[PDB]
């Protein structure tokens, strides 16, 4: 066997059991395949069923759902220790306008 | 009275209980409208490793490890100011931050 190691833009299904955490919840992966793999960490950010209409937050649209990505919410996390699933990917258009949006709070 | 809300560039000693001192990253209307920050945690050992980015100032040096960026709830965790940054440091920490979460 060999394990999954989360890779940019992946939407995965990561452990958080510690406001706006949660979990078991999915998150928009950040950091790239060689970071992650290495480091045995990920930048992510939290996704949610219900949009409250906060600025920060980015759509993702898919089959019969509809949720969000807070940027704003941006954490390394420790993917293997907190076990991780790949739930799927987010549009490269999606990707973008996070990133877009995180650059809004910093830099 | 009137509380103290963190500013970008700021040193701010937060107590992570998932204390400890973080580079401020988020600006301060957001991190005062929201209650939260983004930030990257400080430390003193430092080894090598290519996200580190060093603070330096009077006796002490330090370094922030740049990769691990975290959004904090500033108030709860009950952050107060440590110091500040100097711009060139707080630029070198964006900028490796950067490299990882990037454009494309």
Redesign the interface.
């Given at each position: 066997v060999s394990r999954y190691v989360p890779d940019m833009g992946d939407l995965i299904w990561v452990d958080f059991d510690?406001?706006?955490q949660a979990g078991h919840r999915p998150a928009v992966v950040?950091?790239?395949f060689m970071?992650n793999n290495k480091?045995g960490?990920c930048?992510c950010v939290p996704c949610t069923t219900q949009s409250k209409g906060y600025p920060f937050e980015v759509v993702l649209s898919g089959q019969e759902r509809d949720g969000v990505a807070l940027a704003?919410?941006?954490?390394?996390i420790a993917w293997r220790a907190r076990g991780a699933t790949k739930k799927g990917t987010v549009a490269?258009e999606e990707?973008?306008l996070i990133?877009?949006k995180?650059?809004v709070?910093?830099?």
């Open positions: 510690p406001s706006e950040l950091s790239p970071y480091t960490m930048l704003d919410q941006v954490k390394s490269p990707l973008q990133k877009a995180i650059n709070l910093i830099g």
